Design a protein around this ligand. Sequence first.
Ligand SMILES: Cn1ccc(-c2ccc3scc(-c4ccncc4)c3n2)n1
Length: 328
Amino acid sequence: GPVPFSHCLPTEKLQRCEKIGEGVFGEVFQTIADHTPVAIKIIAIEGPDLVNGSHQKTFEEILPEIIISKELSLLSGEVCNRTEGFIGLNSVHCVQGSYPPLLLKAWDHYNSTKGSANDRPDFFKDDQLFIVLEFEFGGIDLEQMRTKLSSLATAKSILHQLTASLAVAEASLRFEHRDLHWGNVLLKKTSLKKLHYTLNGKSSTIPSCGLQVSIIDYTLSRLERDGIVVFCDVSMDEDLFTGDGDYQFDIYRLMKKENNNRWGEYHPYSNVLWLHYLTDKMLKQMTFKTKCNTPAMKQIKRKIQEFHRTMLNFSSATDLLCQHSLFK
Ligand SMILES: Cn1ccc(-c2ccc3scc(-c4ccncc4)c3n2)n1
């Protein structure tokens, strides 16, 4: 059964913890094990207390996120349908105890530097259960990189990586992310010039432009094996479908329109919608350190604009990857 925090986070690992994200779900810390950054996602479960204004998940209610995390991580090791484009999962632990004071330290630093929407997680008792997910460190989200990318060539690499990753997960797992807003796309330096994927036994490469993309956050995600479907049933959620101020909140409505409010079904067109929303962010809200000044550059720009105009007439990330001119 469950282990103390110290089994996941021995002192040295606790001491190098630094907070890098948060949600209603809980907290994400970066730390170092064997000279290697990792991301620790910590989720309180099974307790009656509100956390960040919401009821804690049960073990059952958190299983889907663990299952989907695992399935997508394992694609990096598969043969017919292989991608590294989802965040690697290193380990999952069920932990019991009060929140480590050293994590409160890191939580405070973050709250005074960047400010938190969360409760200070200091009210947990020594019986409190958490799930600790240890992920590879995927880098920084596209939203925080709004002003940080080199050029629209980078934008194309990112759309290519995302399209291939989703297409491999479509082919393998009948996967839909269902929440791939620009907070859920992480970017990391790679020295690899070419990134590799395999779709239904056919291997290809994507120019990195120095970035490795990692997809994160499976809150809303859906996939299946041998006809067992893991999905988040939002048929009755009301809030999710009433946002505005961003194309993001249209996608929730366009998904529900596409799937007739049946979230158990496979509608890979949801992945096309999210890729459309991301293409839209690339063209409208990203600002690049270099514009498209030279001929070849304006070419790429027109191709991404042509992608923006055309991609919604494709049925899946698989259909885009295989049939869209952007990728040829
Ligand atoms: C199921 N799942 C897989 C990753 C995630 C997630 C959620 C929120 C946040 S906020 C920051 C990260 C993160 C950053 C860097 N490297 C990995 C994860 C993050 N990761 N959830």
